[PDB]
Amino acid sequence: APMTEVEQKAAAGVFDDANVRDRALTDWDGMWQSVYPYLVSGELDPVFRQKAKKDPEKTFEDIKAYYRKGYVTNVETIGIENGVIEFHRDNNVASCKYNYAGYKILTYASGKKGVRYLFECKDANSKAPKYVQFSDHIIAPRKSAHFHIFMGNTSQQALLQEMENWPTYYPYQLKANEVVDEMLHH
């Protein structure tokens, strides 16, 4: 099902807090690929060129740099199924069963808002991040099309303060051109 007007506005960072709801980890079920490799190859260049073309105060160089810092990660693949998140970091792999920890509504310096969905790995000897936060422009149950994930081992509160790095994941099957297509429209 395509987006209602309330969902479209919420995706653009405009929503009433009263509409925000809990979501289950299953919203992010599936196999996913980091888009960072496509920034590196130059394959996301059309996205940044359109962003630049549309705002004369911006430059390609600066927009790319912002997304470089945003996307950068060595976790190339993430798999989510049956309450478990699996992380593929170069040749290291880790997984853990995550417990839901609620959501947090944020207001950004821009005046736009977003909701993060918080999860915790409750192991001692897990190599997987203790704290994970999903942010995907959705404020109520809906299967994700792509997500940013904040990963940390210190606390949720501390992770909530991270604003510059947000490794970003699209469905594993997509090629670079389909990722670009979605970024330019969806």
Known binding-site residue numbers for Zn(2+): 137, 146, 148
SS (H, E, C) the chain: CCCCHHHHHHHCCCCCHHHCCCCCHHHHCEEEEECHHHHHCCCCHHHHHHHHHCCCCCCHHHHHHHHHHHHCCCEEEEEEECCEEEEEECCEEEEEEEEEEEEEEEECCCCCEEEEEEEEECCCCCCCCCEEEEECCCCCCCCCCCEEEEEECCCHHHHCCCCCCCCEEEECCCCHHHHHHHHHHC
Tell me whether residue 90 or residue 164 sits nearer to a second copy (CB atom).
164
Interacting positions 29-88 with Na ion (CB under 5 A): none
Binding mask 51-80 for a second copy (x = CB under 8 A): x-xxxxxxx--xx--x--------------
Q: Residue 2 interacts with a second copy (CB under 8 A)? A: no
CB 163 to a second copy: min, Å: 8
Positions in the binding site for a second copy (CB under 8 A): 51, 53-59, 62-63, 66, 108-111, 163
Positions in the binding site for Na ion (CB under 5 A): 16-18, 25, 100
